[PDB]
Amino acid sequence: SLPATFDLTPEDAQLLLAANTHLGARNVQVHQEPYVFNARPDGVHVINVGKTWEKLVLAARIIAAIPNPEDVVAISSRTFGQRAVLKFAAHTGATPIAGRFTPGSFTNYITRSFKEPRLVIVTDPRSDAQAIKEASYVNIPVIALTDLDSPSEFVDVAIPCNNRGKHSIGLIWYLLAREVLRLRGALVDRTQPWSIMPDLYFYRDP
Amino acid sequence: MRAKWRKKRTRRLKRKRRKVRARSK
Amino acid sequence: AKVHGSLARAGKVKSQTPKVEKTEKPKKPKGRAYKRLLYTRRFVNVTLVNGKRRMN
Amino acid sequence: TRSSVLADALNAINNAEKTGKRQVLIRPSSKVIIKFLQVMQKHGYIGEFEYIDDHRSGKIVVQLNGRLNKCGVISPRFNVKIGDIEKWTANLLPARQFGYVILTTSAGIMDHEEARRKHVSGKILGFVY
Amino acid sequence: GKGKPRGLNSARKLRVHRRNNRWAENNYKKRLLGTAFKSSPFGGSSHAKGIVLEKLGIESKQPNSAIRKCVRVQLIKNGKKVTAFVPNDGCLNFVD
Amino acid sequence: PKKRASNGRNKKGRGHVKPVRCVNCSKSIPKDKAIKRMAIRNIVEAAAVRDLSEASVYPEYALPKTYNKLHYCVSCAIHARIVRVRSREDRKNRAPP
Amino acid sequence: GWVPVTKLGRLVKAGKITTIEEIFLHSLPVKEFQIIDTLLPGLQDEVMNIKPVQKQTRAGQRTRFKAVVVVGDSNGHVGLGIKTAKEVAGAIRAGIIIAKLSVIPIRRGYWGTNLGQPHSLATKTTGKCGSVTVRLIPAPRGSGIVASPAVKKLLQLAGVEDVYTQSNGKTRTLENTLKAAFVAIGNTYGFLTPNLWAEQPLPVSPLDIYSDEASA
Amino acid sequence: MENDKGQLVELYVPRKCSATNRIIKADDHASVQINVAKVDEEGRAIPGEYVTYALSGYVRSRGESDDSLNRLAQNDGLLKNVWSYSR
Amino acid sequence: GRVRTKTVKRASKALIERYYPKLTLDFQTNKRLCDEIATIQSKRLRNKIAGYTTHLMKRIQKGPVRGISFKLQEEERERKDQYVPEVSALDLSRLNVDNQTSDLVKSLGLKLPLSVINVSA
RNA sequence: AGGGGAUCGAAGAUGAUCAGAUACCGUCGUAGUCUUAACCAUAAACUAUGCCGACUAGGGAUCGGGUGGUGUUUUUUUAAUGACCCACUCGGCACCUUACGAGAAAUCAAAGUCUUUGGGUUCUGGGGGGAGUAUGGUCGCAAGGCUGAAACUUAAAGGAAUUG
């Protein structure tokens, strides 16, 4: 199974808690999400940051399984995730797609943006419905940063987090880029803090 | 054309065939 | 419908056509032998292949 | 009103099996349902089912694997003679190599191919395949 | 339940209900009613003999322009008048 | 073929609606199928508030308004530059402009 | 030349995938018709009909010809393709490409007492398109294909030789019947049977075992 | 399946959905094969040795494939208590 | 109006697709070298092409332009995306989790320093 | 058949309009419109969708009943209450999204669990006209209601969508 080192470390806990990844969607609750944990009063549902960690680690293991690093495609059309998938593209193969999807990228090879990935990772499944719809046409697994109310249709392993926060969306991409750099052996020390600041994957308003 | 008035027209002719026949029996 | 007309043109075209007589030809094998004649002409010979295998 | 209990039990299984669910709750769990399920279970079509005992009629929770295509009940229970069994098997089975017509006979409830071995016939209950 | 009764003791309802809906068929109703015997000037037979009474120049229905060269024949066994076609190219000359 | 699910109206569970009369032609029309629009204007008008107030005792007392509810038939409503026509997709929209 | 641009095209051209079975086993989508004939060089085409459809325009009509083409070798594979074009000849040529891209396997079984070289269908498989339902029933040896000439041509081009048929609906529309029968012979592998209850090791797709020869 | 004796027939023995145990057809273009690698006592993935998960297109269409893979991963032990049998 | 057409914008875009380490932001410089790199039939057109590309060069150098992906740009991948905003973004995590988040931490088991305060209403 | 008979108003009378206008439009205006007693037995009497039973996806709103919450507000700050807020549940009129599913389509949580065809049961249809006509019954004061053909005639009528 696991070497018992992959368990949630105390230092990563406040990072998830500071980034407000625990506070998810409001009373609206898709039945496909049992990730909720003791919904807070004032109409706020607290995602189990515990359960997020295993899914985040499990998604990282799937990413590392891809032989060619360029066969992973990171999709983010939401305004809060263009920079995050760009850095994710720098540290791994991870050919990115930020902005408009150019529908048909997974079909009609005559397109200038023809992509044939082995695995796609989407930031917001609702805002990337077109991105995952064409994945289901060409036999492609999908990983999503699913909220507690997202349309999980045609969505494989999905990390429950908060998509209403600038840091929460940015931090998850930073985390998701960490173990894939640890499983691949890029980072020699498993317990290394990796003092490279998580502010790299953060959107700037100017 | 209208089926409403062909129903009405036939009913008015139902009266006639019923009244002309009473002259015999 | 109207029943009257003109019977004076009955068989009008049958009479006007010219009379042409049966061109004499050697008689054709009848029975099993004709099966040979049909077999060889259309499954061995490919002569009548004008554009679409047109035999006529 | 509720005419055949076996029809509802066999109906709930089909809808549950069609949608991929691995379990189904059956009400109100008559004996013929128990005997019918043991015939499906003997061939590996269902697997595990447990009889919940409330004091009125009982309920069944059946564990479903993707090994069942369709299970049916034939209404009414037509009388079937030995020579007439083969006609039933040809009408409502996809092949001659798999699938069983489940028919109640005098010597208990049993499927069609094993009722031939005992050389006994009776009324038809349903089918499984 | 799809309409029809399905009980094992409901053969009378199914047997009777079929008969009443048999009459909707044109052929079944015509055969049982015996309209061919009481109408259709033949006696229900394939051919019938008659006597040519006049010659006719019946027109043709649109779109068509022709004279159909029929004859008015009176059947022998019945005495009814029917119109008979003389099918060939100009054989009305043989039916004087 | 069916054009609307409600089909003209708001009758689900009544069977009868006790019709009201149109305001332009006085045609019978069921109350639910009616096209009620509320007209609440000032008594004088929007731009005439000076001349009344300029020569008004009881200064700026209330400047009250007129309230009345108007019912039209479908024929009169369409002809009166109202709900006139929507495309097949936009017919399903129920929210007011 | 071919110079394929897709994952499957370079794999096939390099000879890394030798049988069409690998494409079917992993449900690999196909986007080039040079793959199908490279793996199956012995499949033959048969055009069924050419019916011209018309659209009202500013000038009378304009006509386009809707070609129907059935391809597939007589052993286990068949593909149906329908395509329209302005000209008759061009529609068939594009009809060939569409038909090849849709090649699917068929399940040949036995009527009973398996003897060798499966002849008939394994189960009773139906198909529907529009109002036409086409049903196929297994038949004993030597029964031939009991079907209409159009459906029989599609069926015998798929490899099956002994099968019964029961169509329903307005069968005079050829496209709906040919599409209904294609689904009928496509559902043959979708039927789980006791012969297929054994567990499988879930083999790895060629896209990852042989990933080294991608486009880059 | 096999004929009277030996020489296996029925070319293209197909795969199966790991969630619903149904055949994944050749035209099932919505189905995927989840591909996850493991680590050996160090936390570094080993290329060439994998853990497979085949999900049919139907399960993904319902959007329940996420839940189905949660319990599939726990039973192999490569995941933690995120999934519970009782709701 | 002075709205250019697709035969002018596409050609100008194609020139920028491959000739950034090339013609500068001055029209007279753009016009003179555009005659030999591109064989344009009419003088009135190569003035239109050179005018639009010169206008384009006044937009790439000030912020990226969408739809223009030439041999280099994707490269700025190391000045304008790293270097966390201006002088800030040196410490963004320094405790304030609400009462409901408090029992989540202990439920997970790990001991995290939490100055939990009841959420005031 | 009595009472009432204000408004509106089949019929009718008039002014227009119109080539004509015994129609639309304007003004009158009987029967009727209301009621009591008694007939009539019809309607696009429509959700054009028979009734009973089981199962199959989510979501909020609302109506009635019930349960719980140191919840809010008012009585006597206080309580029981009444009205609200939150959560759950039964029953109901409905609505929104999607399609594993159905359909020829429009569309449908039923019009789904129907060629992989069987839960129980009642009624109705068999191309279009003739024709709901003729005749015979039976009911009605009557108007008419229910039941209900045949001769003959015809290759199309019809449904839903697409472009013009």
Author numbering:
A (entry chain AA): 2 to 207
B (entry chain Bm): 1 to 25
C (entry chain Ae): 2 to 57
D (entry chain AW): 2 to 130
E (entry chain AX): 2 to 97
F (entry chain Aa): 2 to 98
G (entry chain AC): 34 to 249
H (entry chain AV): 1 to 87
Q: What wording appears in the published article?
A:
Ribosome-associated quality control facilitates the degradation of incomplete translation products and requires dissociation of the stalled ribosomes. A central event is therefore the splitting of collided ribosomes by the ribosome quality control trigger complex, RQT, by an unknown mechanism. We propose that the Ski2-like helicase 1 (Slh1) subunit of RQT applies a pulling force on the mRNA, causing destabilizing conformational changes of the small ribosomal subunit, ultimately resulting in subunit dissociation.
In the C2 state, the 80S ribosome adopted a conformation very similar to a (mRNA/tRNA) translocation intermediate (TI) as described in a recent study analyzing eEF2-bound POST-states. Yet, the 40S head in C2 has undergone a large counterclockwise swivel motion of 20 degrees, resembling essentially the TI-POST-2 state stabilized by eEF2. The RQT in the head-swiveled TI-POST-2 state (C2) showed the same inter-cassette arrangement as in C1, indicating that RQT accompanies the swivel movement (rotation) of the 40S head essentially as a rigid body. It undergoes only a small additional rotation towards the beak of the 40S head by about 10 degrees around its binding site on uS3. As a consequence, whereas the main contacts to the 40S head via uS3 and the Slh1 FN3/HhH remain fully intact, the Slh1 NTC relocates on the body of the 40S subunit, with the trajectory of the 40S head swivel corresponding to a downwards movement of the NTC RecA domains of Slh1 along rRNA h16. The RecA2 domain thereby translocates from near the tip of h16 towards its stem. In this position, an additional contact with h16 is formed by the FN3 domain that basically occupies the position of the HhH domain on h16 in the C1 state. In turn, the HhH forms a rRNA contact with h18 at a position that is occupied by the C-terminal tail of eS30 in the C1 state.
